[PDB]
Amino acid sequence: MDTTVPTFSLAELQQGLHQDEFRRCLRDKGLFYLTDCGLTDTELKSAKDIVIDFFEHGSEAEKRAVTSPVPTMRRGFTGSMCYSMGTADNLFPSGDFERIWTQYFDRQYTASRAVAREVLRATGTEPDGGVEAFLDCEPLLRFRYFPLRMAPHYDLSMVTLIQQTPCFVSLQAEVGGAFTDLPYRPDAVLVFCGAIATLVTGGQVKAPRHHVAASRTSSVFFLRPNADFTFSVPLARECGFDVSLDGETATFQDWIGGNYVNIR
Amino acid sequence: MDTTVPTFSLAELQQGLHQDEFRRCLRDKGLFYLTDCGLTDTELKSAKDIVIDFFEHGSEAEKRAVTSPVPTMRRGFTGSMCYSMGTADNLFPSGDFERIWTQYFDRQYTASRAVAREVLRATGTEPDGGVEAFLDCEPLLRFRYFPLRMAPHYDLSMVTLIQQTPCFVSLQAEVGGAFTDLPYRPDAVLVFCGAIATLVTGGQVKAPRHHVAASRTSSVFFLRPNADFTFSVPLARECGFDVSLDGETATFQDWIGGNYVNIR
Amino acid sequence: MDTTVPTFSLAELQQGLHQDEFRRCLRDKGLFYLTDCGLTDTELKSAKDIVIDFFEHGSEAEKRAVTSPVPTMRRGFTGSMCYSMGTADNLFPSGDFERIWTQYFDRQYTASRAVAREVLRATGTEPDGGVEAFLDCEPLLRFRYFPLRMAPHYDLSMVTLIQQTPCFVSLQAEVGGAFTDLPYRPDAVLVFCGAIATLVTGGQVKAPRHHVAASRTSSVFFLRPNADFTFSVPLARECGFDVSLDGETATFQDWIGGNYVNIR
Ligand SMILES: O=C(O)CCC(=O)C(=O)O
Ligand SMILES: O=C(O)CCC(=O)C(=O)O
Ligand SMILES: O=C(O)CCC(=O)C(=O)O
Ligand SMILES: [Fe+2]
Ligand SMILES: [Fe+2]
Ligand SMILES: [Fe+2]
Structure with a gap:
């Protein structure tokens, strides 16, 4: 096996290309760069600049x-500074900030x-309740400025995109x-597969451990299932x-508890 | 905003005085000293001395x-030594110790x-199930002797009183x-608002992070809700x-789990 | 009290001998060496050698x-390297490895x-649902090679056997x-009582804290109850x-959550 972190074009995966390579990557590595997904340095600039400005001025x-x-880092500002947001109940310092970050969040959420839809397709996975209900979930976006810096761990998300x-x-x-x-790859976003990908596909996807070594900024977008995402208990034990x-069956809530846990 | 930790007289808050100041403190700081609450150095002496004695002799x-x-530090002695107790199932080394600490606990519990009743009043909050049912809860008292010394965190209590x-x-x-x-303030007790205050009042109260820096002793009294304390899920997400x-609704147990978690 | 870690012969405990001594050990220490239990250096050799070989070749x-x-260390290999297994869904590198480790696991599980059956007997404990249903549980075996090394903690198992x-x-x-x-004791296995022993016997058994100080290998076998193990809530609070x-009653799942937690 080649220990290289591969790159996949989203448009190409949607065309039905590189399926075996894609399947093999998910299984043996659980991570890859993603191009042609509406996310480039161009988007990261407006959002970065205006939030960086906010952090400094x-x-x-x-x-x-x-x-x-409550300092949960779920929404708003957090004193390595951080700015988080989700599909709603957000805190925006200004109209300009809101317009920029709402657009940035939607782009991140769409990619x-x-x-994830491709991850489900490649593994021939049909989540209990259907693909769409599964994907219309509870994502969380965290932008951090860093003026080991973060212990090792794997993500409990379906997938996590990082710019x-x-x-x-x-x-x-x-x-x-x-x-x-x-x-960094100004032309691509880094995709980490999380525990939920492993779980929903029956062990066809690996959730790799990672960490931050010891200024930089990172935009981390967690695509997390709903509290009611249901899965087979026997199958979970199998992988x-x-x-x-x-x-025989359980929900994300039964497994993780009443509070989202993003990493482990 | 003035970064000073304010002080409030309990008798005065009960008289209906300093309401706006009180509301503002809860919202922007979530902490304050409390005077005229039946708790002074005079009480702390008997309990401290007899337990200190026990720790040394x-x-x-x-x-x-x-x-x-089980070394849960919930009741009895724990080897920074600690002595914990609650409303029942306590472990007391002697009759004298029991009489002193039972009185000390009741005083702490009453304050x-x-x-907390005032915190609910000032924010015009009526917990699901009523104020009294909410306040007749599961407090935990921990006395520690310290011959950072404690990582940063916020408390998951309604309020936490520290002498x-x-x-x-x-x-x-x-x-x-x-x-x-x-x-220390021989005439006052330090009050930290915890996550439950934030939750029950719909985000009107802040739960500030704190820590212990690097001999001293601390008497920490957690006022914790019952497993069945119920709240609105949508409202929790809003703050x-x-x-x-x-x-739509959930209990403390659904959120925190089957074991009390005091800090986070 | 003598701070010596006592040793008990399993055959002897089954004969009904040393009951008071045994009860006292469980209560005041919660740990002891166990001899005559089908587990000696002879068994540990085949399993150790073949897995050590695997780790190195x-x-x-x-x-x-x-x-x-998912890197949960529940089954298979984990990069201090580790190899874990349970009653099923195991990952074995070869037929020889499988035969050796399956036999090793069964021996460990039987002891x-x-x-544990003796721990229940000595304390006159009859778990809700009966002794057999309680003991036919969810054990986890973890073999680790170590080329503090492990923070202090107590085990949440019924009992934990270590070679x-x-x-x-x-x-x-x-x-x-x-x-x-x-x-080490080539002739005996070390038994740590865990939180579940304390819980099921109503506080008659102590769960001692322990740690690993700073090459060696350790074979740790956790005897863990089923998610449905039921117990009295009032009694749990009493100890x-x-x-x-x-x-009034709760299951292991209600208390611990949807994912096994082995230490605390
Ligand atoms: O800052 C990064 O690049 C990674 C952050 C990460 O892994 C996380 O937030 O889980
Ligand atoms: O020891 C102190 O003063 C503070 C203790 C504390 O914050 C806690 O126990 O949560
Ligand atoms: O490695 C050892 O000897 C002890 C391990 C241990 O206590 C554990 O895995 O809980
Ligand atoms: Fe991560
Ligand atoms: Fe605290
Ligand atoms: Fe242990």
Whole structure:
């Protein structure tokens, strides 16, 4: 096996091309760069700049108004600074910021659902309840500015898309038993498959561990299922999930609990 | 905004005074000193002395008899030594200790419920099931002797009351984006608002992060809701809670799980 | 009390001998060596050698085929290397490996159930649903090669059996308020009582904290209850469990969640 992190064109995957290669990548590596997905440096610029500006020039009063009463980093500002958002209940410092970041979020959300749809297609997977219900989920977008820097872990998402700005290559993932560099690619977004991909496809997809080594920024978009996403308990045990679930079927909520857990 | 940790007289809050100031403090800071609440250095002395004595002169056999089979630090002795207790199922080394600490616990419990009642009043909050059912809960008292010393975090309680004995100021909380000193006050108790206050009031109360920096002792009283405390799922998502709960309403148990989690 | 880690012969415990001593050990220490249980250095050799061989000579392709898509360390290979297995859904590199490790697992499983049966007998405990249903559970076997090395914690199992290969004594447990050495014993297996023993017997059994200090190998076998193991909520609170469970009875799943948690 070649320990290279492959790259796939989204348009090409949708054309039905490179299926075997794609399947093999999902199974043995669980990560790849994605091109032609509506996400490039061009998008990352407007959002990065305006939020970076906010981090450096926003008054203490402005940041307060966009900070949640509970420091969960789910929405708004968080003091490595962070800015998070989802499909709703967002906190935006200004109209300009809102317009830019709402557009940026939608683009990120569309590419994530699209690539995930391909992950389901390539593995011939039909989630309980159907593909669409599964993909119209609970994504979370976290933009972080970093002026190890993050312990090893795998993501519990379906897929996680990451856009970075270069410094030194900080992001690293395990490939072929070794931590491999995952540098910026102004033309592509980095896709990490998470535990839910592994679970929903019956173990056809690997969820690789990764970490941040020790300025940079990272835009991390988690495509997370709904609390009611349902799956087979026996099948989960067949691919490595050490579940303590009574019964034949269970929901994401039964497994993870009442609060989203993004990494592990 | 003034980054000063304000002080409120409980008797005064009950008189209906300083309401706007109080509301503003809860919202922007989530912490304050509380005076006139039946808790002073005078109470802290008897309990501190007798437990300190126990920590320094209790035989290994005496400490065993007051140590739980599972080291959960929920009740009894724990080897920074600790002594914990609740409304029942307590472990007391002697009759004198019991009389002193039972009285100390009741005083702490009464002040916590009282201040919490005011927090609910100021925010015009009526918990599902009523105020009284909500306040007659599952508090936990932990006394620790310390011969960072405790990582940053916020409390998942409704409110947490802390009485300390000075050394250097170890306790610190984030106020205005900066960790501020929270020194002893023989005349007052320090009140931290926890995540449940934020949740029950619909985001009207902030749960500030805090930590212990690097001898001292601290008496920490967590006022925690019952497993059945119920709340609106949509409203929880509106103020920052990244919940994975199916449905419109949920209980504390659905959210946190089957074991109390005090900090996060 | 003598802070010595006692040793019990399984055959002797089954004969009904040393009952008071046994009861006292469970209550005040929660740990002991177990002899005459079908587990000696002789068994540990075949399994150790063949797996050690695999760790040092298995190709990257061979290790991949025995590695789970999700890095949960529940089954198969994990890069301190580890090899895990349970009653089913196992990943074996070869027929020889399978035959050796299946036999090794069954031996470990039989001794664990046997000693646990004695723990239940000595404390006059009858688990809800009966002894047999309780013991036919969800064990997990983890073999680790180590070329503090492991933070302090107690196990959430019923009992945990450990077989080691000496180096320096790395394994240590708290006995009498002090961390005591727990060296290899080619003739005996080390038994740690876990939280479930404490819970099911109503607090008659202690779950001691332990840790690994800073090459060696350890074969750790967790005897874990089923998701549906049921217990009394009031009784759990009586012996130290800080539960947030509504109702009179609860299952292991209600308490721990949808994913097995082995230590705490
Ligand atoms: O900052 C990065 O590049 C990675 C972040 C990451 O893995 C996460 O947030 O899970
Ligand atoms: O020791 C202190 O002063 C604070 C303790 C604390 O924050 C806690 O126990 O959550
Ligand atoms: O490696 C050892 O000897 C102990 C391991 C242990 O306590 C565990 O896996 O819980
Ligand atoms: Fe990640
Ligand atoms: Fe705290
Ligand atoms: Fe352990």
